[PDB]
């Protein structure tokens, strides 16, 4: 299985920058090896929802509209590793962030589906 464990969250500032990192690790049980990345949030009073996402090759990735601009998602060159750069942090922001990998190829990544793994969850407050 993919082990994915996450770090970099924590306290800030609106305005502020942070960087939140997903290493990852093991085989996967489905698909021919690869798999796509994705962040999700968990918002106090709110349902889950995805913030961004990129294929495994990295030709496409997709943000959650009120992240485009500010947000990138990016993978290093050798790879386990997944990166999420928050920049202009605005307090919406508060929440607890989550990184989960994607065995199996999807034709529309804006779609919620095929997470199979999921990381462990980094808080992230922007104070004012
Ligand atoms: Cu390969
Ligand atoms: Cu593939």
């Known amino acids: 299985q993919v082990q994915l464990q996450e770090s970099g969250g924590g306290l800030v500032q609106a305005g502020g920058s942070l960087r939140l990192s997903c290493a990852a690790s093991?085989?996967?049980?489905?698909?021919?090896?690869?798999?796509?990345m994705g962040w999700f949030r968990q918002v106090p009073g709110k349902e889950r929802e995805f913030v961004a996402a990129?294929?495994?090759?990295?030709?496409?990735?997709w943000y959650k509209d009120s992240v485009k601009g500010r947000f990138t998602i990016s993978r290093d060159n050798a790879k386990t590793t997944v990166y999420l750069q928050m920049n202009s942090l605005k307090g919406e922001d508060t929440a607890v962030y989550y990184c989960?990998?994607?065995?199996?190829?999807?034709?529309?990544?804006?779609?919620?589906?095929?997470?199979?793994?999921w990381g462990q969850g980094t808080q992230v407050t922007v104070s004012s």
């Open positions: 989960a990998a994607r065995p199996v190829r999807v034709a529309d990544i804006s779609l919620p589906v095929g997470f199979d793994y």
């Open positions: 093991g085989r996967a049980a489905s698909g021919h090896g690869h798999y796509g």
């Open positions: 990129i294929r495994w090759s990295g030709k496409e990735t």
